[PDB]
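retry 2 of 3: previous attempt timed out while embedding magnesium ion. Reduced batch size to 1 and resubmitted. Inputs unchanged:
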Amino acid sequence: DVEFPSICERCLGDNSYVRMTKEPLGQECKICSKPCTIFRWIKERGQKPGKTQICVGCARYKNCCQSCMLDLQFGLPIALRDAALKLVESGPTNDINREFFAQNQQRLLSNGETAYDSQEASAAARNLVKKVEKRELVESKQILKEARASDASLNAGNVSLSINMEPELADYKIRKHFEQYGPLKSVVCSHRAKCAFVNFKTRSSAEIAAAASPLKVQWGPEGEVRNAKLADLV
Amino acid sequence: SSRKFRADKRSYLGALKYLPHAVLKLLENMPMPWEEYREVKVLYHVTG
Amino acid sequence: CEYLHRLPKDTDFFNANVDCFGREKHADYRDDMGGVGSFLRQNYTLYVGGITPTDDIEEIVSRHFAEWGDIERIRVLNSRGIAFITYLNEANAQFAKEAMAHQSLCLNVRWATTDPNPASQARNQ
Amino acid sequence: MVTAEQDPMEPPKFRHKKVPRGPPSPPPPVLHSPPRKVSAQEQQDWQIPPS
Amino acid sequence: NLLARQFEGRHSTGVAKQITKQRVDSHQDLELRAAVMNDILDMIPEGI
Amino acid sequence: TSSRALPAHLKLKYRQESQGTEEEVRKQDLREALLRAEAAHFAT
Amino acid sequence: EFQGRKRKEFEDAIRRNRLAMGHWMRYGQWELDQKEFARARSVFERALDVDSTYIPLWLKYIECEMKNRNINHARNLFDRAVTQLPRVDKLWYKYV
Amino acid sequence: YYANTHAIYGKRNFDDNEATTSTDLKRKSQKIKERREDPGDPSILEGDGAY
Amino acid sequence: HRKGLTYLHLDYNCNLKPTKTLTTKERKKSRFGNAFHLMREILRLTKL
RNA sequence: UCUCUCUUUGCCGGCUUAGAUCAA
RNA sequence: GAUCUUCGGAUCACUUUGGUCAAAUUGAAACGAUACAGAGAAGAUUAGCAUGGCCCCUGCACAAGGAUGACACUGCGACAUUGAGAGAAAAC
Ligand SMILES: [K+]
Ligand SMILES: [Mg+2]
Ligand SMILES: [Mg+2]
Ligand SMILES: [Zn+2]
Ligand SMILES: [Zn+2]
Ligand SMILES: [Zn+2]
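retry 2 succeeded.
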């Protein structure tokens, strides 16, 4: 009898006793673009009142919370759920098609069959974590000296490098690696070039950090990747 | 002409429907020639 | 003031409805991608455009961006002053997006669109 | 649970946008009597000339 | 009505328009053509 | 909304006693009445 | 962009005269030349919603399903067609 | 609901060192009153004991 | 002003006068009905 | 049983005072 | 705090916060101008009324207007093939 909106108890307050109001037809569904009733309550004294933002047809076809839109089974954003878990196909993003899908899905879904069962949801969660753990575990000579000497003069089967003392992996990994070798200024990097250049407040920290040497390095777009292919022949 | 009251403009404009009623109630109680001023009981929207 | 005057940290997860900056997130994602992103997609990278003084654009933006939050990927076009810095958390990402607009490096900070690289799409997924 | 009262002066809250009509229920079987034969002669007798 | 049309839209679809002494002929012609279409659809036998 | 949609004729009229309600039509004998009326017309 | 342009032109052409089955047949053919499934079926069954008694459309749909070796799909389509029009022998003959 | 809200606040602030009675209500109010500054006297109106 | 008709000036005596020469498009867009004009004139009388 | 050609081959915008007038 | 009551106490009152959303570049619309063509019915000038809908605008309007408001008004294969000949091929 237009009784309740579905809200999880994380954003329903830690009090088992709360009061809320409804304003019928108070907003257009942010997905259905449909006239829907609003519900306002207080999570806890001292913060701004919450309110429901999506209709009852949604957050049910999505099995989600009308206010926080965290999925009611796992508790992480429904967008990330449908992007990574990929349980069942979602709707479009354009206006007319999205509202058409919302209307027809609400119709065929109130006919009685449920579009969301949690058994397959947990199965897909375990499948995703399994795939994650699975993820966890003369032509070369001519493209070698073709341009290295050119740049070296301009601004400076097997190949073995030299070690000099002249005075997938994000950048924060570099940040928490060099912090014990001296203060950091900026870490400029590029995955394609695979070259990460750091700067310190003093050259003494740089030289003491570089002395730790015996995967590591010591001192256009495609134009910077010529020496990155040396990784294939390192 | 201020955004401080930008939330009330829709209600402010919807009272345009009942404005002629306000005109009738105002003209019905116009002071007569023999009285210098007349105090009228009034009912107003909290929006103004 | 009634709001935090500090920098968001690693464990500062907010509601999906409320923008991590305190605002609210709609669904249509607009056409200029101007003020606040949509909740139907989560992009950790932002388009920053502006000056292209010399080859040191990468380092200057790095200097001007590390202080705003944890950085994941910096990709700055050499031909034009266009960069696509990718952040680690939504809070730092949107804080820097809102906090660096019309600054000196005015900067045209906007929300990035879908990356057409099938490899970048694969790694992002 | 309390129904919040609406402002009497409040105009219509939002626009209404038309939606193309949804698909109907799927058509029933036809159940016709078996078709009769007409033959080419009667096919010709119902042929109309151009105007 | 003015404020409803202002804040809602035309709602042009799904409205009827009475015959008003200028559409009389153009509506009579439409009705006659529809009737003739029905008669054609009927008197022509099956599969012709 | 529209001028012609305003309330009007809010009282539905029912057939009264001598106006030919269902009770009388069931009680009446329509057949011989019809033949008598036809004969009266024929006489003219 | 080319499929978008052709799609928009065909979509208006079928919205203007929704009873023109030739437009739906041509739209299904042109859509079938690259993206062989899913929305092809959508467009075709939309046309059947417009008029399910058009036997040429049913036959065209069957043939278009069989070109791409979808057999069980076509058998389901025949069951629908034969339970819809049991007194036309063309569908029965093609089925058998 | 009043009691549950009070209990939640007490649990959050860990400050539950009070009792309940009839005279105890006035006794609790006494110290909150003495912390308060006095209410001025009307017709004293611009500083120096304004109401 | 919720019609974009910002070039029309409603003076304090309730006269609708354009502030600039209007093209055909503006003139057709800025045409009000009998309700608005009737209410404006009643308001003018009340102000008198 | 192929290839080409010919032939056979049933076949798949409306209304009104014609809307009204008309010399280099 | 007022009232009684007998210095035990009793009365009297009892949980706000209308939120197109935090001090206006980057989440209330819709465009100016310049540059191109640039005014329905088979010659030419031209009355109009209609049909269709994810096209609207003015209007209080189920009047009427906006160029007859604008756009649109076409076209194909549930064709069965045999009727025959010729060189080849495999076949009367
Ligand atoms: K004309
Ligand atoms: Mg008209
Ligand atoms: Mg028209
Ligand atoms: Zn929730
Ligand atoms: Zn919805
Ligand atoms: Zn502050």
